[PDB]
Ligand code: HEM
């Protein structure tokens with residue numbers, strides 16, 4: 001369980017993300033796909049993209065980035081009371097997309113990397129630790145839901 005103090009570090013960096021969610025989503029998706037190319041193969045819409053330049057120029061990738069980060073934002077803003085938000089997300093990522101927890105760990109890493117790089121003013125050691133705690137809570141709750149849904153993750 002996160003303290004309120006930890007949630008405020010989380011939401012204070014998220015407020016900077018929200019200056020330009022589209023830009024942050026591009027950086028984060030591209031970071032994921034470059035760091036762990038196997039993750040791109042899960043995307044039938046995007047797996048043809050060969051290079052970072054092609055990724056940067058993809059209007060649909062940018063759109064998806066916004067979808068992803070807005071969903072994650074809505075979860076974080078619940079400060080752990082995210083049962084309703086996680087249900088549809090768990091069901092799609094388990095049953096339709098088939099995303100192992102391992103890959104959730106990878107996008108968590110991508111998120112932290114990008115925030116560390118873009119927001120040194122709001123992502124010092126304490127803030128990063130809070131965000132890590134929030135993303136670990138997220139993955140823990142998702143993993144539990146995966147199991148309920150019949151997916152080993
Ligand atoms: C913070 C973690 C994540 C969030 C908040 C997130 C959020 C979303 C949302 C909102 C959608 C659209 C609605 C849906 O189908 O549920 C989506 C679709 C999808 N997600 Fe995720 N996602 C996350 C992690 C992942 C990861 C790590 C992968 C793969 C490595 C992945 C693969 C997909 C795929 C393949 C789709 C369908 C894309 C399409 O429209 O063709 N997601 N995600």
Ligand code: NA
Pocket residue numbers: 019020
């Ligand atoms: Na800006």
